[PDB]
A = this chain, B = another copy of it.
Amino acid sequence: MKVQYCDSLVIGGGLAGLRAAVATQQKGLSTIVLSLIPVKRSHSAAAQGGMQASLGNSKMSDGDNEDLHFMDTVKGSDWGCDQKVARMFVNTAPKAIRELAAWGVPWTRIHKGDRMAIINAQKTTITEEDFRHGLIHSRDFGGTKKWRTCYTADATGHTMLFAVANECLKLGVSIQDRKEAIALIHQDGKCYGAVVRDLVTGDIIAYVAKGTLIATGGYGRIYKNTTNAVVCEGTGTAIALETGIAQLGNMEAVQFHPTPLFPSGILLTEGCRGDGGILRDVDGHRFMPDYEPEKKELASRDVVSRRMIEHIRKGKGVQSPYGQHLWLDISILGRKHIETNLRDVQEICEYFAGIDPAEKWAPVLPMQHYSMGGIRTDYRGEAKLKGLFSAGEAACWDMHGFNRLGGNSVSEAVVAGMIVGEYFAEHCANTQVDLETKTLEKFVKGQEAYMKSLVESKGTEDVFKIKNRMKDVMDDNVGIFRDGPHLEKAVKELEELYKKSKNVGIKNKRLHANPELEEAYRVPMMLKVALCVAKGALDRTESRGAHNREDYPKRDDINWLNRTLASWPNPEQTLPTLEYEALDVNEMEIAPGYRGYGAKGNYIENPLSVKRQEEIDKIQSELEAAGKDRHAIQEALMPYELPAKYKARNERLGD
């Protein structure tokens, strides 16, 4: 038997998974980092827009602060997130972005002088003072009433992933690409590590360690049309669910992006609009402050996208041999504001769309892009399976709720990595474990058998036909607009397939570097993660954030101010066991109301919502008359907990 130990494993060398391993390895904990493909090729690299931090340097980031970011985030969450987490976060992003910039990351910085902004209408000539020259700059982004989205051109995610990964290499972390986690190791509801299958040699190894973190990124690939890389299949989400002890949260909360270059699905940044570029209809105008006057563009995903399907369902979808769609005209947004800062989102258009960006509008169309849900964990990172932590799009720490805010995911990545890191190092350095050879063997010898059955399998299902059929079902019925009948013909076929996925037959017998065998043990997992979303969504009868239910269009606060905690307790069962967890209004620093946009007055209101509001304004006004700063009041309304290292307040420009 092959076994390898380390003080702290880290399943997923993404952007978040790496930051975490940095905060552990930097303090004696010998750590490992498994990964399908070499780290610097993760999906983070493909980050366009930027990182959002309540910084406040730019003439626009000006006057920004935790509170504003806090609110911007919370209101965007359509109130389905954990307020004290969103709080920990905001107070860390700033000092997170600074660390990065000090590690190399070249953030496009401010220059003394007058700019040439485009705003919504047109050119407005902005002027940055001179006490701002050389400080991290910002961009206007989706749903922000302040410019706090930082950037390094439009390939921001890239310069970050590298700056971090490079750091691990400096510390002696151990990267081990082409190695996949296929099952976690638990004994008495405790995680001892994982069972890994060397994608190349093909042999199973047991990776044991005191702690174990899972950062396997989104699951956008359970859908046919997604912007996510082809290795964002949620296998990692799947294996924590297969332990039947931990639970996935809001698995049905899937965010969709408005302008992914159709049909490839290759992203085309929001900096398009935040930089002034705007959406042209089929008639070719602005269904912009036409459908929603506070700008259609510069509104949340679930918003800006919704109507993008309305105009089309009214038959106004000017298709092609693949489908109806719209266009994004940034032709009028200068050839300097395009040939730079929308540099990729221009080459992307020439090499694929075979046309020019500073020329025309693109054949776009909303598709899946982010995955809020995932392994549900508490505020410190740990889950229900004590010992197993999580962070990144991969899990549901939930500072997102039912609608992530543009430029937050890759801020949550480093932030969460910093926070959940300190709490992971703590656990591994203290918790003592009882490693049992009988158990280790049970899991390993048990996984090996699994591989064999698959090879000696005699069933006759084309995993590629079952796989592709799943992605069809999802993208169709669980699209932007969901309804009772369709989230049933789905929850049904998705099940009928998890049953067919056990009768598959592969042609290539080899037990090594076999790609076919990979898609055989990978699919069944995806389906189980698919059932969690489809069924998870079917049950949740109302319309909140990215969850639009044509038949329960009102954001029910009285019944659905909870989180769909999906589990899979028994090995046999074909459908997830959805239990719900309620939210406490008397812990919210901001009570349930209108989100600043979206359709007005469409939420069946809850009584405690108001009551809490009153006593918020009570406390508010009293401590303002008393002469208390915003931190004192924050502390009043709702206190949040943070680790030592990241306690101090973020010093801003002009105090």
Chain B positions within 8 Å of A3 at CB level: 5
Question: Number of contact residues on A: which range applies?
Answer: 10 to 19
Whether A30 sits at the interface, judged by CB under 8 Å, is yes
Chain B positions within 8 Å of A434 at CB level: 434-437
Whether A318 sits at the interface, judged by CB under 8 Å, is no
Whether A471 sits at the interface, judged by CB under 8 Å, is no
Chain B positions within 8 Å of A30 at CB level: 1-2
Whether A7 sits at the interface, judged by CB under 8 Å, is yes
Given A1-B30, A5-B4, A7-B1, answer yes or no on A436-B435 (Cβ-Cβ < 8 Å).
yes
Chain B positions within 8 Å of A4 at CB level: 4-5
A5-31: CB near B (< 8 Å → 1, else 0) gives: 101000000000000000000001010
Q: How far is the CB of A211 from chain B (nearest CB, A)?
A: 11
The listed residue with most B CB atoms (<10 A of its CB), out of A5, A433, A438, is A5
Cα distance A2–B5 when bound, in Å? 8
Q: How far is the CB of A489 from chain B (nearest CB, A)?
A: 50
Contact B436 A433 (CB under 8 A): yes
The listed residue with most B CB atoms (<10 A of its CB), out of A7, A28, A435, A437, is A437
User: Which B residue's beta carbon lies closest to that of A29?
Assistant: B1
Chain B positions within 8 Å of A7 at CB level: 1
Whether A125 sits at the interface, judged by CB under 8 Å, is no
Contact A435 B435 (CB under 8 A): yes
Whether A210 sits at the interface, judged by CB under 8 Å, is yes
Whether A460 sits at the interface, judged by CB under 8 Å, is no
Cα distance A438–B1 when bound, in Å? 23
Chain B positions within 8 Å of A437 at CB level: 210, 432-435
Q: Using a CB-CB cutoff of 8 Å, which residues 410-458 of chain A contact chain B? A: 432-438
Cα distance A435–B5 when bound, in Å? 12
Q: How far is the CB of A454 from chain B (nearest CB, A)?
A: 22
Cα distance A7–B438 when bound, in Å? 12
Residue from the list B5, B432, B436 in contact with A5, Cβ < 8 A: B5
Q: How far is the CB of A191 from chain B (nearest CB, A)?
A: 14
Question: What is the count of identical protomers in the complex?
Answer: 2
Q: How far is the CB of A1 from chain B (nearest CB, A)?
A: 6
Chain B positions within 8 Å of A210 at CB level: 437
Residue from the list B2, B28, B438 in contact with A432, Cβ < 8 A: B438
Cα distance A28–B2 when bound, in Å? 10
Q: How far is the CB of A2 from chain B (nearest CB, A)?
A: 6
Chain B positions within 8 Å of A435 at CB level: 434-437
Q: Using a CB-CB cutoff of 8 Å, which residues 503-547 of chain A contact chain B? A: none
Cα distance A30–B1 when bound, in Å? 6
Q: How far is the CB of A441 from chain B (nearest CB, A)?
A: 8
Chain B positions within 8 Å of A1 at CB level: 7, 28, 30
Chain B positions within 8 Å of A5 at CB level: 3-5
Cα distance A3–B210 when bound, in Å? 12
Chain B positions within 8 Å of A432 at CB level: 436-438
Chain B positions within 8 Å of A28 at CB level: 1
User: Which B residue's beta carbon lies closest to that of A433?
Assistant: B437
Cα distance A2–B28 when bound, in Å? 10
User: Which B residue's beta carbon lies closest to that of A435?
Assistant: B435
User: Which B residue's beta carbon lies closest to that of A4?
Assistant: B5
Q: How far is the CB of A563 from chain B (nearest CB, A)?
A: 34
User: Which B residue's beta carbon lies closest to that of A431?
Assistant: B437
User: Which B residue's beta carbon lies closest to that of A6?
Assistant: B3
User: Which B residue's beta carbon lies closest to that of A3?
Assistant: B5
Cα distance A433–B436 when bound, in Å? 6
Q: How far is the CB of A7 from chain B (nearest CB, A)?
A: 6
User: Which B residue's beta carbon lies closest to that of A439?
Assistant: B432
Cα distance A30–B432 when bound, in Å? 26
Cα distance A358–B4 when bound, in Å? 58
Cα distance A1–B2 when bound, in Å? 19
User: Which B residue's beta carbon lies closest to that of A441?
Assistant: B432
Cα distance A7–B445 when bound, in Å? 14
Chain B positions within 8 Å of A2 at CB level: 30
Chain B positions within 8 Å of A436 at CB level: 432-435
Cα distance A28–B436 when bound, in Å? 19
Cα distance A432–B434 when bound, in Å? 13
Q: How far is the CB of A171 from chain B (nearest CB, A)?
A: 15
A103-139: CB near B (< 8 Å → 1, else 0) gives: 0000000000000000000000000000000000000
Cα distance A608–B325 when bound, in Å? 106
User: Which B residue's beta carbon lies closest to that of A208?
Assistant: B5
Cα distance A435–B438 when bound, in Å? 11
Cα distance A433–B5 when bound, in Å? 16
Cα distance A372–B610 when bound, in Å? 89
User: Which B residue's beta carbon lies closest to that of A5?
Assistant: B3
Cα distance A28–B434 when bound, in Å? 25
* A/B interface sample: 20 pairs, CB < 8 A: A1-B7, A1-B28, A1-B30, A2-B30, A4-B4, A4-B5, A5-B5, A210-B437, A432-B436, A432-B437, A432-B438, A433-B436, A433-B437, A434-B434, A434-B435, A434-B436, A434-B437, A435-B435, A435-B436, A435-B437
Q: Which 9 A-B pairs have the closest CB atoms?
A: A435-B435, A432-B438, A3-B5, A432-B437, A433-B437, A1-B7, A5-B5, A434-B436, A2-B30
Known: A1-B30, A434-B437, A435-B436; 10 extra A-B contacts, CB below 8 A, are: A1-B7, A1-B28, A4-B4, A4-B5, A210-B437, A432-B436, A432-B437, A434-B434, A434-B436, A435-B435
